[PDB]
């Protein structure tokens, strides 16, 4: 099969990483931070290997590949919580995959 549909399936939605997030932060808030531009498919906040606490960065899924790009630049580089929140895409895990180049 060759990917070419949408709806009842998720190929690989865009993922945005948000660092400099204080404990006070929660799925709701983090969800309202992006929801402003583009709804959030899912919200996850990794924790310490031992302690169940937001290590430091969070994961936010999006629907389109545009909204995310906007919130990324817009947010990243703003004055929040008395600091410069790092709202950008994850470090690793490319959103693309090798395969049929021409087909």
UniProtKB/Swiss-Prot annotation:
Compartment annotation: Nucleus
Domain of life (superkingdom): Eukaryota
Positions carrying Phosphoserine: 26
Region forming the signal peptide: none
Domain RRM span(s) in chain numbering: 14-92
Tissue expression from the record: Strongly expressed in pancreas, spleen and prostate. Weakly expressed in lung, liver and thymus.
UniProt similarity note: Belongs to the splicing factor SR family.
Record's function text: Involved in pre-mRNA alternative splicing.
Protein name per Swiss-Prot or TrEMBL: Serine/arginine-rich splicing factor 8
Organism: Homo sapiens
């Amino acid at each position: 099969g060759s990917s070419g549909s949408s709806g009842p399936d998720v190929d690989g939605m865009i993922t945005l990483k948000v660092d400099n997030l204080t404990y006070r932060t929660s799925p709701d808030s983090l969800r309202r931070v992006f929801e402003k531009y583009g709804r959030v498919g899912d919200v996850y906040i990794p924790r310490e290997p031992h302690t169940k606490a937001p290590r430091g960065f969070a994961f936010v899924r999006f629907h389109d590949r545009r909204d995310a790009q906007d919130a990324e630049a817009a947010m990243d580089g703003a004055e929040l919580d008395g600091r410069e929140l790092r709202v950008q895409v994850a470090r690793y895990g490319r959103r693309d995959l090798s395969g049929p180049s021409s087909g």
